[PDB]
Ligand SMILES: *C/C=C(C)/C=C/C=C(C)/C=C/C1=C(C)CCCC1(C)C
Ligand SMILES: CCCCCCCCCCCCCCCCCCCC
């Protein structure tokens with residue numbers, strides 16, 4: 001039994017350990033992550049004056065998302081460096097028994113908080129036509145919670161039981177597909193009877209949303225995407241996972257918020 005090594009990161013850390021490059025790169029990409037959220041926090045606060053009152057709830061939710069993301073990605077970053085330690089003999093970083101070990105809790109909590117806010121906020125910028133506010137809202141929130149919960153359950157079994165990891169990921173994916181389906185409704189209805197410039201921004205938002213959100217399951221799967229003898233079943237998978245999460249974080253939270261801000265202004 002390899003009892004020290006909960007998740008793939010710990011598993012690698014406890015067995016092969018991480019090269020200087022993988023340790024440092026992961027550390028640095030996670031740092032950039034939280035750095036960008038803090039910048040984004042200040043951006044959304046400073047620019048709130050640039051949109052009409054009726055749209056400002058969106059700016060508000062952008063800012064609160066930035067707070068949660070800053071704190072929890074900061075905590076995650078520290079947890080990474082705290083968890084692995086240099087062995088001079090071998091010249092690699094190994095799971096440190098006198099630490100807390102790498103923990104996915106920070107990110108999944110961040111998701112639990114941010115997903116419902118990101119989905120909600122667009123409903124304060126665009127108008128529906130034939131759909132009802134309260135139904136779209138409840139649909140986003142329900143499927144959003146279920147997506148994360150099932151995903152979290154899946155994550156538990158990542159090393160102990162890969163079959164379970166993937167099955168729960170598939171269940172999660174179903175809730176994902178529902179959310180995509182509703183969002184696409186929202187965007188189409190939101191286009192009707194706004195200026196073409198605004199329609200164009202909404203088109204960009206749709207593609208951003210679709211791509212950035214799909215990165216998350218990408219990064220979930222990343223280490224397994226070349227089989228269990230594979231290039232990615234390795235510290236390179238860890239590096240790729242964390243890189244892709246961070247790109248997704250910046251895209252889904254910051255860029256998304258900026259575009260919604262921009263839409264609100266064309267509607268102002
Ligand atoms: C700001 C953070 C966001 C927008 C996080 C979004 C997370 C997801 C869309 C996660 C999706 C997942 C699946 C659909 C399958 C694998 C498990 C998850 C939870 C990673
Ligand atoms: C060390 C990392 C550097 C931090 C800077 C990160 C920059 C993101 C902060 C939010 C800035 C968004 C500004 C976008 C301006 C778009 C204006 C569009 C009008 C056409």
Ligand code: NA
Nearest residue numbers: 081082084085
């Ligand atoms: Na260390």
